[PDB]
Design a protein around this ligand. Sequence first.
Ligand SMILES: Cc1ccccc1Cn1nnc2ccc(C(=O)[C@H]3C(=O)CCC[C@@H]3O)c(C)c2c1=O
Ligand SMILES: Cc1ccccc1Cn1nnc2ccc(C(=O)[C@H]3C(=O)CCC[C@@H]3O)c(C)c2c1=O
Ligand SMILES: [Co+2]
Ligand SMILES: [Co+2]
Lengths: 379, 379
Amino acid sequence: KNPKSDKFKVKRFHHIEFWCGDATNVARRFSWGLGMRFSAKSDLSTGNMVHASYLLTSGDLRFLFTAPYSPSLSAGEIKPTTTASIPSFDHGSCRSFFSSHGLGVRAVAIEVEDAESAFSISVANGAIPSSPPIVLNEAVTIAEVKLYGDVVLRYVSYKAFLPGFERVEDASSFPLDYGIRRLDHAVGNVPELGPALTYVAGFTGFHQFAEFESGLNSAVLASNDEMVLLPINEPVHGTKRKSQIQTYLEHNEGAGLQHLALMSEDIFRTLREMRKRSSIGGFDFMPSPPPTYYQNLKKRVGDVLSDDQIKECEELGILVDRDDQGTLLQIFTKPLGDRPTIFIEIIQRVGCMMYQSGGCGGFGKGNFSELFKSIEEYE
Amino acid sequence: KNPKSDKFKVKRFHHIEFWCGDATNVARRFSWGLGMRFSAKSDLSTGNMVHASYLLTSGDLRFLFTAPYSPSLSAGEIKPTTTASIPSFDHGSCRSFFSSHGLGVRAVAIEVEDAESAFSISVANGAIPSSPPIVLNEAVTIAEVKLYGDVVLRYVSYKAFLPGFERVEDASSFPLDYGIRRLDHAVGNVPELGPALTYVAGFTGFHQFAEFESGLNSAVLASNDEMVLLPINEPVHGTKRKSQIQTYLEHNEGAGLQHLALMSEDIFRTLREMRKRSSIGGFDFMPSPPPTYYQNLKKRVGDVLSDDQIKECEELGILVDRDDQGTLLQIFTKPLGDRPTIFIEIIQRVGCMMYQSGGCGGFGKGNFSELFKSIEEYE
Ligand SMILES: Cc1ccccc1Cn1nnc2ccc(C(=O)[C@H]3C(=O)CCC[C@@H]3O)c(C)c2c1=O
Ligand SMILES: Cc1ccccc1Cn1nnc2ccc(C(=O)[C@H]3C(=O)CCC[C@@H]3O)c(C)c2c1=O
Ligand SMILES: [Co+2]
Ligand SMILES: [Co+2]
């Protein structure tokens, strides 16, 4: 059931912005670890005396890394005279965010038809405003509302990256590519799922995406065509094993973005390339499941994957899940930074062809029981 | 002239500690860019609820990257019950340092015979105490005094990395090596050279190392055997071209560490390997000099380098200087992070064999005039 109740026209995920203490080192690490090319910049070299911002791209995926300069460089400026390319940026907000949460996502940005309208309708329907609509060089409009914790939902609309950003020099722009193509979903952890859902569904009109002792309850909000997917988790307390959602909330100092799921056009190539670089500056992956997991895969997905595709999952630690319509290949990195908070998921979806429908195969919640089962019986 | 006036016994540079907002991403970037192996850690996985600290090593060079966790993780602790492995660490000091200066060196650490004695003698001779001597697991003693800005000189002495640090798992520890072997010198930028020299020479007994419109005045303080080398720069104002020391002070919010010089056993291999990785997560280098610079090299160092070693300098952008005793090969990276502040120098010294004497060939200040000259005549 999809009531298509969006209160304004939503297109696709546009970008994800990390707030950093040093954008250069985070961006360079991410570029090498994920195979994303340096595509645009806004910084001292482009006249921006406020913040350093670097954009990485892989296919349609856009990762933005931003950090503040010394406020003294821009102390003479006022908002009408700002050299910032992202007018919502605030030194104090950025420093407070990173000292509170460490490295993490500040903005989940979606492209809309009309960012001023999206902002107005959102706030009229309960959204907490974060930054009012601002038109950039008469070409792009950006507005922000609170999503959860200190994460904002950013609306971007284009009349025709952002004004004031410059393209990166070819010598400075090495064409890395490990097969990642777009953001599939972005997941938040909150203390209470009910109020978080009521709030976000309330101001967007996003609807609950149909699903099918893991320490969580979750639900997924989705746009009309179910290409913007925003799952939200809450912890389940009292368990023997402590909820990883509760661990997140403690180390993050509250609610925030838990993981980003990046769609690959070839998850096997992506995982070969990322795993090659794990120990030389890239990303680590969670501990692989025991062989019983892959032994149990023939009974579960033998009609979708060959034996030569299943043992290849075993080689790379890929997980597999399935719903009524499609099949999901997924794997999770270790946390992206110092704290056990944000991580990345790599995903490939098989099925639901009409183009592929959104969320084809679900989000892998069956892998919770399947992993525990495989572990126990592996003993 | 070397009066050998050290007020306490100094051995060698021991490590350099960067204060970061996220130690993981900085350490992984540096490891790949410089060919340094992950060697030890102190973090949540080792029981440290205070700070995340990661050690990179290449030969005798030790780079430590530290960032604070949420204070809430350790709010029940007191200094007698701390889980920090570096007892001088303070959340507030670290967050203040990184918000003020961005990514940079907090501690220049030298190994001494007796860190408690070094601290006491230093403070008795005018050193401003930063952290009193503390004995770690009855095995290592660490103490800190102010050096310049918010940079400390850290004394480390061993009765026999640090207690509480654990060695990094072999699978997590990839044996990168581009030929870097030790720290040659560490350079500070200050507003006024005179008072900075009087202070540091005053409490160490370090002596002025003999030298031979660049925007700076500088002097070098050295230990008895001239293996601990601490150059200090001040800006020269009024010039046509603005002093890079003044630019540093403005963007750094005052005095701090300007550059680290890393000795390579083979600067050609090091620069080939680093330059290969510049655009894939590593470090960039300053713009190469014009061909007139390398055309002028035969007249200056033709008795030390072959033609096949000189054009190889041209290929890699290596600079060359010479004093009365030895020859210096050097090159400079672009700034290591967002701000135009700290950078790295790669160095190889030729000559002064007895082992090699310290500072053999000087610090390359002739390359200031030689670079400008080559540029002008290249036109
Ligand atoms: C780390 C850990 C700790 C305890 C037990 C298991 C594991 C490892 N693990 N197993 N199965 C998973 C299945 C799905 C997902 C998602 O993507 C989610 C999503 O997208 C929306 C719905 C909520 C999800 O959780 C994730 C993270 C995992 C997972 O992390
Ligand atoms: C970036 C810039 C801007 C203006 C003009 C020239 C350049 C490039 N440049 N040329 N020659 C150099 C020669 C030596 C050194 C050192 O190592 C120092 C040292 O170790 C102690 C003594 C003080 C030094 O400066 C350095 C950084 C450079 C250098 O940076
Ligand atoms: Co997911
Ligand atoms: Co130098």
